[PDB]
């Protein structure tokens, strides 16, 4: 791998300012973040500023504590890219589903280290 689980969380699930959140956005972002070799079945990107995400995981102090699962208090603007039609290799076909909702993440050392991607499957 490369850096920490937090840095991977950001490259895999964070996109501050999307220039449109439609199906074209997914076709582009999935290719850009390297999620098309082979075609990934589903992938959600979180929007807005980073501090709001880091805040889901904050602790009173910094005394080492085990990792735990948390449901964020407030809602977030997210965009979920879902594979459509079963294309297994590029050109991967996707469809975007935009949303505003809470997210479930694993937290450690005050940073998000994993997104619960299964909750975005919906229908």
């Amino acid at each position, epitope marked *: 791998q490369d850096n920490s689980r937090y840095t991977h969380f950001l490259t895999q699930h964070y996109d501050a300012k999307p220039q449109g959140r439609d199906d074209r956005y997914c076709e582009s972002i999935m290719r850009r973040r390297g999620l098309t070799s*082979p075609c990934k079945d589903i992938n959600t990107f979180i929007h807005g500023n980073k501090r709001s995400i880091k805040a889901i995981c904050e602790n009173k102090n910094g005394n080492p504590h085990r990792e735990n699962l948390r449901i964020s208090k407030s809602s977030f603007q997210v965009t979920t890219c879902k*594979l459509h*039609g*079963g*294309s*297994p*290799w590029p050109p991967c*076909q996707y469809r975007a589903t935009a949303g505003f909702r809470n997210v479930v993440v694993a937290c450690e050392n005050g940073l998000p280290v994993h997104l619960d991607q299964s909750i975005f499957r919906r229908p």
Partner: antibody, heavy 121, light 112 residues
Framework: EVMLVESGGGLVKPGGSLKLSCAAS????????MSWVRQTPEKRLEWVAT????????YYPDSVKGRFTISRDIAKNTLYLQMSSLRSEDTALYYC??????????????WGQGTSVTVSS | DIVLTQSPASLAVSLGQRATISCRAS??????????MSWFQQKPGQPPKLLIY???NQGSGVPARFSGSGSGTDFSLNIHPMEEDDTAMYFC?????????FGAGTKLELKR
């Protein structure tokens, strides 16, 4: 349970054409990506073509691109391999296979018993 | 293409002992924490049968004596205890990218 019956193979003259078919049953055909894989006389396995569950994506190896065409008749639950400008190198046993999805790491979970093709004069 | 070098080409193992077959890829077959690698078993007079997918998961109805391991560019299939019914031709195969490619195969026979 699952079944894939191939047919249509035979002896064809070099330069000729041939169309293979695969009758699928026992599962929801249109809900799966499908492929053709051949086994040469020397016993090697060579991927020949794939078509997606939706039907919009087809893929081919450089060796047969421009000569082979895979397709599907939803109604008849049947996959096809249209072969043209056949060469002696195309002599082999052609298998019909079902591809698993992302969750199965795009593996081939079911193989039919195959139909043979012999390209010769 | 991702070239798969499978070895050895042939091997004979005694009952109860173990068979180890390896497959080395010229490039990684991994992504998203998954190894897009499969192992197939082909007995005489029959088409190939799925043995292992995602490098280490058992296909349906596949005995625990068959286990696959590895990641990146190096993979292995181990059979232990070897049984008389395991005589067959085995192949590895990658699905990370097209063209899909197979290893050249391993011929496994029972030693007696």
């Amino acid at each position: 349970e699952v079944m894939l019956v191939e047919s249509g193979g035979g002896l064809v003259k070099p330069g000729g054409s041939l169309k293979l078919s695969c009758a699928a049953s026992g599962f929801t055909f249109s809900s799966y990506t499908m492929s053709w894989v051949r086994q040469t006389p020397e016993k090697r396995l060579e991927w020949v073509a794939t078509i997606s569950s939706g039907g919009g994506n087809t893929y081919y190896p450089d060796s047969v691109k421009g000569r082979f065409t895979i397709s599907r008749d939803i109604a008849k639950n049947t996959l096809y391999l249209q072969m043209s400008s056949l060469r002696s190198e195309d002599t082999a046993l052609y298998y019909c296979t079902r591809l698993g999805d992302y969750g199965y790491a795009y593996t081939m979970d079911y193989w039919g018993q195959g139909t043979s093709v012999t390209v010769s004069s | 293409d991702i070239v798969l070098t499978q070895s050895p080409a042939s091997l004979a193992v005694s009952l109860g002992q173990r068979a180890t077959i390896s497959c080395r890829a010229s490039e990684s077959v991994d992504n998203y924490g998954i190894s897009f690698m499969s192992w197939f078993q082909q007995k005489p007079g029959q088409p190939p049968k799925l043995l292992i997918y995602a490098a280490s998961n058992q296909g349906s109805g596949v005995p625990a004596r068959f286990s696959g391991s590895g990641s990146g560019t190096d993979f292995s299939l181990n059979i232990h205890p070897m049984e008389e019914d395991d005589t067959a031709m085995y192949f590895c195969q990658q699905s990370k990218e097209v063209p899909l490619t197979f290893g050249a195969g391993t011929k496994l026979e029972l030693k007696r």
